[PDB]
Design a binder for this molecule. Structure first.
Ligand SMILES: Nc1nc2c(ncn2[C@@H]2O[C@H](COP(=O)(O)OP(=O)(O)OP(=O)(O)O)[C@@H](O)[C@H]2O)c(=O)[nH]1
Ligand SMILES: [Mg+2]
Length: 168
């Protein structure tokens, strides 16, 4: 196809659930066991082929530490989509993700597409968040849910592509 589309996507979530790792896996096909904490935000881009359209992702990888909370709107304000990430081995991170979803639903663009990533799915032997419970929460709140693993690549390309498919 000869069509070209572009959209802004922001990743939000508690530190250190794997936001930067998810982006690095999608954009560079890499995974680093040792990743420095993000400061403020980092920016990356990736262009993919979706059917007959060349979609360009402008990705804002936010720092998740609490001290950066007041900067979040600078990154989500003009976003067309968001991925709120939690760590499946940490229930508190899942509760934090729900509060990020509430903030987006109240202060981001009314038509933002929101996805929920249950990351570090490769650590299911240490699961703290039930898959079905998270799916139910996502369904009730109109969120695109997938468990992912930046470490193995599980569902990483899939979650980004599913978001792109749901954009106008
Ligand atoms: N096992 C496993 N480790 C992961 C996964 N994703 C990230 N990690 C590890 O988790 C740690 C934190 O990952 P980051 O990507 O820096 O986390 P972050 O959400 O960007 O952290 P902040 O920038 O502080 O908000 C690193 O040691 C990663 O290698 C995953 O899917 N599985
Ligand atoms: Mg980071």
């Amino acid at each position: 196809g000869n069509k070209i589309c572009q959209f802004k996507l922001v990743l939000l979530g508690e530190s250190p659930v794997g936001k930067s790792s998810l982006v690095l896996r999608f954009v560079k096909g890499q995974f680093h066991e040792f990743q420095e904490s993000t400061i403020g935000a980092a920016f990356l881009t990736q262009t993919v082929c979706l059917d007959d359209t060349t979609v360009k992702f402008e990705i804002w990888d936010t720092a998740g530490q609490e001290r950066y909370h007041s900067l979040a709107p600078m990154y989500y304000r003009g976003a067309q989509a968001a991925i709120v990430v939690y760590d499946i081995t940490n229930e508190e991170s899942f509760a934090r993700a729900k509060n990020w979803v509430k903030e987006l639903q109240r202060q981001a663009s009314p038509n933002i597409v929101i996805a929920l990533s249950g990351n570090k799915a490769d650590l299911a032997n240490k699961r703290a968040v039930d898959f079905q419970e998270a799916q139910s929460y996502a369904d009730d709140n109109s969120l695109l849910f997938m468990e992912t693993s930046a470490k193995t690549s599980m569902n990483v390309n899939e979650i980004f592509m599913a978001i792109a498919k749901k954009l106008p």
